[PDB]
Amino acid sequence: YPKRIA
Amino acid sequence: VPRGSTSEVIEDEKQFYSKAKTYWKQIPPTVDGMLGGYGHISSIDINSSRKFLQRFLREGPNKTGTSCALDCGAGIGRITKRLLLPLFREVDMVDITEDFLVQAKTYLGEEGKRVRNYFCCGLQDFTPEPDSYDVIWIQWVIGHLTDQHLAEFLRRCKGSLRPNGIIVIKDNMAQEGVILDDVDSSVCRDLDVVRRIICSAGLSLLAEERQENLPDEIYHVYSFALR
Ligand SMILES: Nc1ncnc2c1ncn2[C@@H]1O[C@H](CSCC[C@H](N)C(=O)O)[C@@H](O)[C@H]1O
Numbered sequence: 125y126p127k128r129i130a
Numbered sequence: 131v132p133r134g135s136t137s138e139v140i141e142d143e144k145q146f147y148s149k150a151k152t153y154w155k156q157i158p159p160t161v162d163g164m165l166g167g168y169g170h171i172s173s174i175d176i177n178s179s180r181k182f183l184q185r186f187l188r189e190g191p192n193k194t195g196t197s198c199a200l201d202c203g204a205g206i207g208r209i210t211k212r213l214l215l216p217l218f219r220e221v222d223m224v225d226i227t228e229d230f231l232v233q234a235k236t237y238l239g240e241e242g243k244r245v246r247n248y249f250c251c252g253l254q255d256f257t258p259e260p261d262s263y264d265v266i267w268i269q270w271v272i273g274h275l276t277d278q279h280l281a282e283f284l285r286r287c288k289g290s291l292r293p294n295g296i297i298v299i300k301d302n303m304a305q306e307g308v309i310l311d312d313v314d315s316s317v318c319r320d321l322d323v324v325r326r327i328i329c330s331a332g333l334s335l336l337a338e339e340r341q342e343n344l345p346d347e348i349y350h351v352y353s354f355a356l357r
Binding site for chain 1: 164165166168171270302309311318344345347348349351
């Protein structure tokens with residue numbers, strides 16, 4: 125899914 | 131040194147898969163659940179997917195057919211509803227999470243009567259029927275397979291394409307390497323890694339496109355059309 129860059 | 135394969139990041143393959151199944155079992159069966167809280171971007175995504183796909187539906191010798199599509203990691207059927215059912219006579223769905231496939235029957239509504247098979251199966255255990263699909267759509271799920279299993283699944287998908295059929299992968303891409311999310315039990319791979327896997331499955335790129343108009347904080351998203 126659309127995901128914040130870790 | 132960046133990691134270049136899932137074998138460098140996954141401690142235990144059986145736990146990699148079992149943890150992901152447990153993660154998705156506790157997500158609500160809603161578009162916001164499918165999209166990790168970014169439900170609001172769904173229309174941007176579908177519009178871009180439609181334009182990417184329509185490239186391959188033009189008349190000519192290589193025109194992709196419109197008889198049947200397969201939606202892989204379909205969830206509740208966001209893509210089946212908004213992209214695939216309007217364009218394909220029938221659609222099959224495959225997903226590991228039974229509760230999503232149950233919800234799909236409601237979510238899809240009347241047009242969902244044209245969903246043929248609802249397969250409740252991990253991709254790693256799924257063998258699509260030979261010579262069955264015009265389009266195999268694989269979105270926001272390849273990071274749940276190991277490199278070996280993704281390569282094998284793509285080989286099985288190749289065998290299931292109709293003449294002029296294509297496989298589409300749409301997913302997050304890492305800037306570099308292979309990055310584990312240990313919370314949802316998935317990986318993000320860079321473009322070189324993904325291309326390596328596609329080549330190893332005996333597939334070739336027809337097109338590659340970056341998704342525009344996404345929030346600045348998230349992984350970049352790319353689409354690949356393959357045969
Ligand atoms: N190994 C696996 N095999 C098949 N489906 C899987 C899987 N691991 C996770 N999934 C499914 O992958 C989906 C990711 S969410 C994205 C859903 C859909 N592709 C969309 O873009 O709207 C979930 O429905 C989840 O149950």
